[PDB]
Amino acid sequence: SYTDSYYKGQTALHIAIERRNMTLVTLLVENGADVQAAANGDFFKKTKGRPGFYFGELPLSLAACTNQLAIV
Amino acid sequence: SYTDSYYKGQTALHIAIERRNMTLVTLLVENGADVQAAANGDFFKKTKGRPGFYFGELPLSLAACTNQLAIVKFLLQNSWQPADISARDSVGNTVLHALVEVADNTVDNTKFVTSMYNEILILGAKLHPTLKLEEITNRKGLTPLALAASSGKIGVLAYILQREIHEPECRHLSRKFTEWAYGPVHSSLYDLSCIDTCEKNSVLEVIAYSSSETPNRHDMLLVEPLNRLLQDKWDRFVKRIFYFNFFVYCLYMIIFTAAAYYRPVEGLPPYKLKNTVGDYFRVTGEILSVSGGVYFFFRGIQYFLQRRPSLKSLFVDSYSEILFFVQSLFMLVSVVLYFSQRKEYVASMVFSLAMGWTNMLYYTRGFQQMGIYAVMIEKMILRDLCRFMFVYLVFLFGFSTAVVTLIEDGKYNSLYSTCLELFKFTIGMGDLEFTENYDFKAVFIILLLAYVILTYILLLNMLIALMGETVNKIAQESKNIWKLQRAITILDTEKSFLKCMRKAFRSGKLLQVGFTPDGKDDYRWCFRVDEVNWTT
Amino acid sequence: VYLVFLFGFSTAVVTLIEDGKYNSLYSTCLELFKFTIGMGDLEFTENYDFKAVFIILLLAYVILTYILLLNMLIALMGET
Ligand SMILES: C=C(C)[C@]12C[C@@H](C)[C@@]34O[C@](Cc5ccccc5)(O[C@@H]1[C@@H]3C=C(COC(=O)Cc1ccc(O)c(OC)c1)C[C@]1(O)C(=O)C(C)=C[C@@H]41)O2
Ligand SMILES: CCCCCCCCCCCCCCCC(=O)O[C@H](COC(=O)CCCCCC)COP(=O)(O)OCCN
Ligand SMILES: CCCCCCCCCCCCCCCC(=O)O[C@H](COC(=O)CCCCCC)COP(=O)(O)OCCN
Numbered sequence: 001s002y003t004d005s006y007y008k009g010q011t012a013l014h015i016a017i018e019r020r021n022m023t024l025v026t027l028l029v030e031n032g033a034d035v036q037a038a039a040n041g042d043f044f045k046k047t048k049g050r051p052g053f054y055f056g057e058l059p060l061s062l063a064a065c066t067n068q069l070a071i072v
Numbered sequence: 073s074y075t076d077s078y079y080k081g082q083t084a085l086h087i088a089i090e091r092r093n094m095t096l097v098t099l100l101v102e103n104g105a106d107v108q109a110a111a112n113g114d115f116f117k118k119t120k121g122r123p124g125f126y127f128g129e130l131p132l133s134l135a136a137c138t139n140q141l142a143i144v145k146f147l148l149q150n151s152w153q154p155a156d157i158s159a160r161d162s163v164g165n166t167v168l169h170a171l172v173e174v175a176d177n178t179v180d181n182t183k184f185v186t187s188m189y190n191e192i193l194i195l196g197a198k199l200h201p202t203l204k205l206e207e208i209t210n211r212k213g214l215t216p217l218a219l220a221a222s223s224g225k226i227g228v229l230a231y232i233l234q235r236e237i238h239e240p241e242c243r244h245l246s247r248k249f250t251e252w253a254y255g256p257v258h259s260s261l262y263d264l265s266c267i268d269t270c271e272k273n274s275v276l277e278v279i280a281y282s283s284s285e286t287p288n289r290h291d292m293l294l295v296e297p298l299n300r301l302l303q304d305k306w307d308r309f310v311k312r313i314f315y316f317n318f319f320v321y322c323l324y325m326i327i328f329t330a331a332a333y334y335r336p337v338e339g340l341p342p343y344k345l346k347n348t349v350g351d352y353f354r355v356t357g358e359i360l361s362v363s364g365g366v367y368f369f370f371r372g373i374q375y376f377l378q379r380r381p382s383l384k385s386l387f388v389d390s391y392s393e394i395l396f397f398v399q400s401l402f403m404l405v406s407v408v409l410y411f412s413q414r415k416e417y418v419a420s421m422v423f424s425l426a427m428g429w430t431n432m433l434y435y436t437r438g439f440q441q442m443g444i445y446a447v448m449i450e451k452m453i454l455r456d457l458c459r460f461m462f463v464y465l466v467f468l469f470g471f472s473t474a475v476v477t478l479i480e481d482g483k484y485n486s487l488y489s490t491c492l493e494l495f496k497f498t499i500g501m502g503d504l505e506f507t508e509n510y511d512f513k514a515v516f517i518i519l520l521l522a523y524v525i526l527t528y529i530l531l532l533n534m535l536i537a538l539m540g541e542t543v544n545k546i547a548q549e550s551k552n553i554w555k556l557q558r559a560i561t562i563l564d565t566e567k568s569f570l571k572c573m574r575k576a577f578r579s580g581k582l583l584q585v586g587f588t589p590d591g592k593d594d595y596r597w598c599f600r601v602d603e604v605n606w607t608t
Numbered sequence: 609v610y611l612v613f614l615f616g617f618s619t620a621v622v623t624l625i626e627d628g629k630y631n632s633l634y635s636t637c638l639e640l641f642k643f644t645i646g647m648g649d650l651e652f653t654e655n656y657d658f659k660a661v662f663i664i665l666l667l668a669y670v671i672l673t674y675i676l677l678l679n680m681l682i683a684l685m686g687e688t
Contacts, residue, residue: 018254018255043254043257051257051602051603051604052257052604053254053255053256053257055255065255066255329619332619332623333619333622333623335623337626415657416658418623418624418658419624419658419661421623422620422621422623422624422661422665423620423661423665425616425619425620425623426616426617426619426620426665427616428616429612429613429615429616429619430612430613430616432612433609433612436609445609445680448680449676449677449680452676452680453676457671457676492650492652495667496650499646499670499674499675500646501646501647501648501649501650535675536679539676539679539680539683540679540683540686543680543683543684544683544687547684547687
């Protein structure tokens with residue numbers, strides 16, 4: 001996962017869910033990918049004076065937030 | 073070609089291109105027709121008080137302007153007589169300047185002009201990869217971008233600043249570079265070149281020092297890269313320097329007030345010092361006050377030389393510099409009378425002192441909430457009182473002369489005291505005490521009551537209603553007004569800067585593309601912006 | 609805004625006058641405040657020096673504060 005101060009904890013599954021790739025999500029979960037990682041960098045936390053995207057830091061919350069019921 | 077003063081230089085090719093007749097254009101160009109003729113009659117030049125059609129005087133510009141892409145391609149790409157994409161007219165305008173000028177900020181026109189602009193750029197890149205059309209300046213020194221900003225072309229400006237061409241081999245024509253995107257967020261780099269550091273005439277200078285007649289003067293600062301730039305410059309350096317200047321002005325005015333209050337009351341200036349503490353503090357304050365006056369005098373002169381404002385718009389813009397300059401003039405006249413041994417220097421000094429306090433309202437602008445009061449006061453003085461002054465003076469001089477003629481030997485047999493009394497009646501603090509027993513008392517009473525009804529009741533409330541609508545008109549325009557004033561402050565702070573510092577740039581001199589048409593790389597002073605958009 | 613105007617003209621007037629009822633910041637600030645709300649005097653029966661400058665200053669104050677600023681406040685309050 002990303003180790004920097006901004007994208008900390010982001011992994012492949014978050015990108016796959018964001019990109020709306022059902023197949024890659026299935027492949028990652030099949031290969032033992034963690035479905036309960038926390039993506040908890042400054043880009044992903046609640047904030048007012050900064051651009052960002054808060055979603056709850058978890059792939060399940062991300063899939064729900066982006067309106068992808070099938071992945072949920 | 074036409075030989076008269078109106079259609080001078082027009083030829084068949086111009087008519088054919090206007091007629092959208094591809095066949096005639098093909099025939100004429102085939103027969104050796106000059107594709108770089110100049111049509112430079114009065115019908116074809118830039119003009120304000122005359123109907124006309126300016127297009128840049130050349131067939132290529134005409135073909136682009138009328139939305140005939142095919143003829144542009146044919147003129148540039150046919151071998152019989154190729155057209156010079158870089159040609160300039162008498163004004164110095166290239167085709168891109170011509171396209172900028174014939175914008176009008178409507179949806180359909182913006183689509184037409186923007187599209188033709190972009191296609192001309194692609195054709196230029198393919199035909200002449202070593203040519204940079206957008207840097208070519210017309211006779212006023214303006215590039216197409218500077219010209220678009222100058223004329224208030226919001227659509228063309230918003231297009232150019234946010235230009236992104238998703239095509240290989242011509243990405244160097246882009247200015248916006250989307251580095252990445254997430255759900256609602258995306259990050260791009262903006263080119264920034266000749267926005268802030270241009271060395272001829274940058275975008276922000278042109279928007280700020282526009283003449284207040286440009287239609288979209290405030291809207292042009294809402295376009296994304298500019299707004300973020302101004303916010304960054306404000307938060308980094310300009311904010312602290314602004315507060316420091318305001319504090320120093322406050323100290324200056326306190327010193328001036330204290331120096332003025334404790335003036336000596338004996339006769340015949342200049343006044344010699346005594347070896348005492350009070351005189352040393354007083355003369356110290358006097359020296360500092362006069363120094364400040366000299367400083368404002370020279371700043372005003374530098375302003376009027378650098379800007380060269382015309383008489384018509386002298387007050388419409390530059391109101392603040394005028395008032396600061398007039399304050400300094402009162403100070404200098406006071407010094408001249410002081411050493412010239414006249415007590416009447418006091419009469420000058422107090423005026424400067426009064427003005428010195430009210431010019432504090434200059435510093436309220438640049439605040440979102442408080443700048444509205446300074447803006448309103450400026451506009452009400454310049455438009456409502458100044459128009460109303462003539463109407464009120466007609467009434468005042470009429471009834472004053474009537475009353476003074478009627479009266480023989482009273483307090484009303486003098487134009488000065490009579491004008492004072494009627495003025496007081498206008499603002500509701502007269503008397504109407506008819507205790508005197510002069511002749512023509514009935515006529516005197518009828519005249520005064522007619523005056524009081526006409527001026528206190530009718531005219532004054534008319535003025536107040538008009539001022540009320542002016543106040544309501546610009547209550548809702550507050551945000552725009554604030555933004556523009558903050559921009560002007562930032563530019564002036566960069567101009568003076570008083571510390572040998574020229575850290576006017578925002579982000580680094582980073583490689584943008586690295587792939588020119590040739591084997592070099594471009595470093596362009598890009599600026600990173602991450603935006604949020606909740607669409608879908 | 610109002611205090612900027614008031615302190616400006618109050619200090620100017622007090623500096624101009626030597627030994628009157630206007631040679632005091634307290635009474636002068638009171639008088640100019642009364643002028644703002646339309647219950648002053650404008651009685652120039654006194655015969656001190658610089659009478660013309662005193663008159664011009666007070667009339668400029670009365671136009672700027674009683675006519676211009678006060679009705680600006682009233683228009684804004686009316687919209688609220
Ligand atoms: C040169 C001009 C235009 C001007 C200079 C003087 C004489 C002025 O009166 C006027 C004429 C006048 C006189 C009396 C009532 C209304 C207008 O308007 C201004 C000018 C107008 C004002 C009005 O008060 C202000 O709010 C000043 C001001 C407004 C907005 C600003 O952005 C500002 O920043 C510099 C200053 C202040 C005076 O300069 C002042 O302090 C005195 C003693 C008279 C006012 O002449
Ligand atoms: C709001 C919009 C509508 C406004 C309507 C206006 C109404 C104003 C009220 C009337 C005011 C009358 C003024 C007082 C009359 C007066 O006191 O004076 C009269 C002299 O004649 C006049 O002035 C004629 C009256 C003026 C004509 C009319 C404008 C008689 O003389 P004496 O003083 O010696 O009285 C004898 C000794 N005590
Ligand atoms: C509604 C918006 C438009 C507003 C327009 C404003 C018009 C107001 C006109 C009022 C003018 C009042 C003139 C004062 C005359 C006066 O009373 O003072 C004179 C000296 O004149 C001056 O003050 C200088 C001129 C002042 C000019 C000031 C603009 C000396 O007379 P005495 O003392 O010897 O009187 C001897 C017997 N008592």
